[PDB]
Design a binder for this molecule. Sequence first.
Ligand SMILES: Cc1cc2nc3c(=O)[nH]c(=O)nc-3n(C[C@H](O)[C@H](O)[C@H](O)COP(=O)(O)O)c2cc1C
Ligand SMILES: Cc1cc2nc3c(=O)[nH]c(=O)nc-3n(C[C@H](O)[C@H](O)[C@H](O)COP(=O)(O)O)c2cc1C
Ligand SMILES: [Mg+2]
Ligand SMILES: [Mg+2]
Ligand SMILES: [Mg+2]
Ligand SMILES: [Mg+2]
Ligand SMILES: [Mg+2]
Lengths: 204, 204
Amino acid sequence: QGITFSKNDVEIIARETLYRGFFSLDLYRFRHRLFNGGMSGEITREIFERGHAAVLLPFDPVRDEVVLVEQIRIAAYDTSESPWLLEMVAGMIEAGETVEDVARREALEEAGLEVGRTKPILSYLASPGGTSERLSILVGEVDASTAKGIHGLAEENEDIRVHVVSREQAYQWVEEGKIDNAASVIALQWLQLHYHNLRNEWTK
Amino acid sequence: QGITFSKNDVEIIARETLYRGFFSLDLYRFRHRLFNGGMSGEITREIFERGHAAVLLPFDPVRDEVVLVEQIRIAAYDTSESPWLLEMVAGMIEAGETVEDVARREALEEAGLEVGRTKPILSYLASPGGTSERLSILVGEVDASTAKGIHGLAEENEDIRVHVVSREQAYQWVEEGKIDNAASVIALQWLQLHYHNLRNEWTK
Ligand SMILES: Cc1cc2nc3c(=O)[nH]c(=O)nc-3n(C[C@H](O)[C@H](O)[C@H](O)COP(=O)(O)O)c2cc1C
Ligand SMILES: Cc1cc2nc3c(=O)[nH]c(=O)nc-3n(C[C@H](O)[C@H](O)[C@H](O)COP(=O)(O)O)c2cc1C
Ligand SMILES: [Mg+2]
Ligand SMILES: [Mg+2]
Ligand SMILES: [Mg+2]
Ligand SMILES: [Mg+2]
Ligand SMILES: [Mg+2]
C-alpha cells in the first residue's frame, strides 16, 4: 500500500531559471520510472519557486473562538467577489528559521497576538503540479479578547484587520465559501475534526 | 460581519506578463484602500498564472472507499521524501468548459472511472499571495471495484496509477502526512465531516 516509486527512481538532470525576480520560475528537466516498467524520456515542467510558509490557526480554547486576519490578495481578484480575504496568520520561512518562530512573529505583527502552547496541524503542498510551495500549519493557543484592530507592517505594504469569530462561525464561513483559501480551509476543517480533544487538552 | 472592502476599493493600474511559456508570471500593479482610511501607494506583486482546475474526489458510498491516483509531481521533490503523490482526479478547465464536465472527463482518463452523481465540496484559492489558481472540488459517485490499473495520457507524459483504499485509511494518511497535497487534504477532510450523510443520500 502507498506510493510506488522513490527518489531512486527519478533523476533531475538540470533546472533552468526561466524568471528571476522577487520569486523565481524554474524549468525542471528530469526522467523518471513509469508504472509500466520503463523509463520516461526527458520531461520538463515549469515550477513556481516562492519559498515555504508557516501558518498559524489562532484558537482560544477557553472561549472557543478563532482569530482571522483580513487583507488584500490581488491574485484572488479574477475569480473572487473581492480580493480582500479572511485568512490565517502566516508568513515566509527564511533560511535557518523554525516554523514556530515564524508563526509567533507573524502572530504579533499581523494580529498583535501572543501565543501560548502550540501543536502541529498539517503540512501541505499548495499546488504541486506547478509550485514547490509547502505550508506548515500550527494551532496556537491565544486569548482572543486581546486580538483586535489594524496590524501589519505598513512599511511593507501589509495592511491587516483582525476579526474574531466563534469556531462554529468560522467553519460556517468555510461551508458558505466566505473563507476559501487553502490554508484557512485546511486549518478550520482540521479544527472541526479535533476541537473536542484540543479544548480538553488545553483547559485541563 | 465579513470583509471590509470590495473591487470598487482597489485600482489595478496595469498587469505585465514577465514570462510566458506553458504557464505565465504576471506583475500586477495596483493601489488599494487602507483600513485606517486613505489609499495605499502603488504596489506590485508577482503572480503565477496557470489557469484554474476542477478536482474530483471519487467516493464509493456502497463500500465507503475512495479512489486515489498516483503520479509524479516533481515540484514536491525538494520538501518530500518522494515526488510521487497520492491525489484526487483533477484537470485544467479550458475555455467554455464547466467544472463538472472536466471532473467527469478526467475521472475517465486518469482512473478509468465512470461517475454517477456529483455534489460540490468547496472551491478554494491554492495560495493567493502568489498565484491566482482556483480549484473547484466535486465529490463523485463511483464503483471502486472498477478502479484499477495504469491510466493517464502517456502521449502527454501523464503516467498514473490507481489505488483503492477505505475512506478511513485515506483520512489516516492525511493525519499521518502520507497525503499532503491541498486538493486531497481539503477533499478528504470534507469527506470525514460529511460521509455519513453522503452515504445515506447516495444509497437511498
Ligand atoms: C497534456 C500536456 C500536459 C502538459 N503539462 C505541463 C505541465 O504541467 N507543466 C509544464 O511545464 N508543461 C506541461 N506541458 C508542456 C510540455 O512540457 C512541453 O513543453 C510541450 O509539450 C512542448 O514540447 P516540445 O517542445 O518538445 O514540442 C504539457 C504538455 C501536454 C501536451
Ligand atoms: C517585506 C516585503 C514583502 C514583499 N512581498 C512580496 C510579494 O509577496 N510578492 C512580490 O511580488 N513582491 C514582494 N515584495 C517586493 C516588492 O513588491 C518590491 O518589488 C520590492 O520591495 C522592490 O521595490 P522597489 O523597486 O521600489 O525598490 C516584498 C517586499 C518586501 C520588502
Ligand atoms: Mg539518487
Ligand atoms: Mg501574512
Ligand atoms: Mg506578515
Ligand atoms: Mg490528477
Ligand atoms: Mg489529467
